[PDB]
């Protein structure tokens, strides 16, 4: 019953270490104006 089904995320592990190192979308910012701790 549904043998070929990618349940667990593939990037999970990859994104796992990435998250640990807080290496996520570090894209720029559009007018901060105080507030929003980054």
């Amino acid at each position: 019953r549904c043998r070929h089904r990618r349940r667990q995320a593939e990037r999970l592990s990859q994104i796992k270490r990435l998250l640990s190192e807080k290496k996520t979308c570090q894209c720029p910012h559009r007018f901060q104006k105080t507030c929003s701790p980054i």
């Binding site: 995320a9 990037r11 994104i15 998250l19 996520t24 979308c25 570090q26 894209c27």
Partner: peptide, 29 residues
């Protein structure tokens, strides 16, 4: 309390830095 595995499974990645973007949640205090 709420599971923190769902969002991860359906996580997205930006198309600029090739990194995994984080959708707005609200707070965490």
């Amino acid at each position: 309390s709420h599971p923190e595995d769902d969002w991860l499974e359906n996580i997205d990645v930006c198309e600029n830095c090739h990194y995994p973007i984080v959708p707005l949640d609200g707070k965490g205090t």
